Amino acid sequence: GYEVHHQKLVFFAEXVGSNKGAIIGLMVGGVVIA
Amino acid sequence: GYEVHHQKLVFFAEXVGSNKGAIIGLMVGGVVIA
Amino acid sequence: GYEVHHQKLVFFAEXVGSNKGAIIGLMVGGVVIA
Amino acid sequence: GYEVHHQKLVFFAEXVGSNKGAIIGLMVGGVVIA
Amino acid sequence: GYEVHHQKLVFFAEXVGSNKGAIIGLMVGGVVIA
Amino acid sequence: GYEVHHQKLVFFAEXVGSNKGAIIGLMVGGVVIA
Amino acid sequence: GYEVHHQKLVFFAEXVGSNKGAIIGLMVGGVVIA
Amino acid sequence: GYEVHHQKLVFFAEXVGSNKGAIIGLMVGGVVIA
Amino acid sequence: GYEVHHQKLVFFAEXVGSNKGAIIGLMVGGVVIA
Amino acid sequence: GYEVHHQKLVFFAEXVGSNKGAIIGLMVGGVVIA
Amino acid sequence: GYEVHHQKLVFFAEXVGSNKGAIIGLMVGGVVIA
Amino acid sequence: GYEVHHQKLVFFAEXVGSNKGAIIGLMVGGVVIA
């Protein structure tokens, strides 16, 4: 079990052209890339 | 079981042309890229 | 089981031309890209 | 069990062209790259 | 069990072209590269 | 059990072209490269 | 003459008990405290 | 003459008890404290 | 004449008790303390 | 004439009790303390 | 004339009790202390 | 004329009690102490 709390996240992104993947600020769980 | 709470997220994005993927600020669960 | 609560999310997006993917501020569940 | 709390994260990204992977600010869980 | 708290993280990224891997600011859990 | 707290991390990255591995600012857990 | 434009401001405040002063997100002009 | 434009400001404040002064995110002009 | 543009500012504040002065994230102009 | 542009500023503050002065992240202009 | 651009500044402050002066991350112009 | 650009500055401060002077991370211009 995951207990994630009290996060202050600021995400700046620039350009980001032809993104074919995942761009996530805060991710809880699992990321599978194929 | 996931328990996510008390998040203050700010997401800035610029440009972002021809995005074919997922751009997520806060994601809970699972991301599969194929 | 997922328990997500108490989120303060601000999402800024600029440009974003010809987006063919998913642009989500807060996502709970699962994202599959194909 | 993971207990993650009280994080102040600032993420700056520039360019980021043709990203086919995962770009995450804060990730809790597991990342599998294939 | 992992207990991670009270982190002040600043992440600067530039260029980052054709990224096929994982670029994470703060990661808790496990990273498998294949 | 790991107890990590009170970290002030600043991460500067430049160029970073065609990254196929993991670039992490703060990582807690385990990294397996294959 | 002041020309202020194109500002994206996010202001988070917590607690803030018995405030006797001015708490302003974006202020243009002049502030006099006495 | 002042020409201020294109600002992305995020302001986090915590506690802030019995504030008798000015707490400003973005201020253009003049501040006099007495 | 002042020409200030293209600023990405993140301001974290904690505690801040009995503030009698000016706490500003981005200030353009003049500050006089008396 | 001052031309200030393209600044990425992150400001962390802790405690800060009974501040009678000016605490500024980015300041353009002039500061006079008396 | 001053031309200041392309600055990546991270400012950490701790304690800072009874500050009667100026605490600035990035300052352009002139500072007079009296 | 001053041309200052491309600076990556990290400033750590601890304690800093009863500061009556100027504590600046990056300063361009002139500092007069009296």
UniProtKB/Swiss-Prot annotation, chains A, B, C, D, E, F, G, H, I, J, K, L:
Changing residue 16 to C: Causes formation of an artifactual disulfide bond with PSEN1. Zn(2+) 2 binds at residues 2, 5-6. It is found in: Cell surface. The record marks 25 as: Implicated in free radical propagation. Residues 16-34 are annotated as: Interaction with PSEN1. It comes from the Eukaryota. The record marks 27 as: Susceptible to oxidation. Glycans are attached at residue 2. Changing residue 34 to V: In one chronic schizophrenia patient; uncertain significance. Cu(2+) 2 binds at residues 2, 5-6. Changing residue 26 to V: In CAA-APP; Italian type. The record marks 8-9, 11-12, 32-33 as: Cleavage. Interacts with FPR2. More effective reductant than amyloid-beta protein 40. May activate mononuclear phagocytes in the brain and elicit inflammatory responses. This is Amyloid-beta protein 42. It comes from Homo sapiens (Human). The gene is APP.
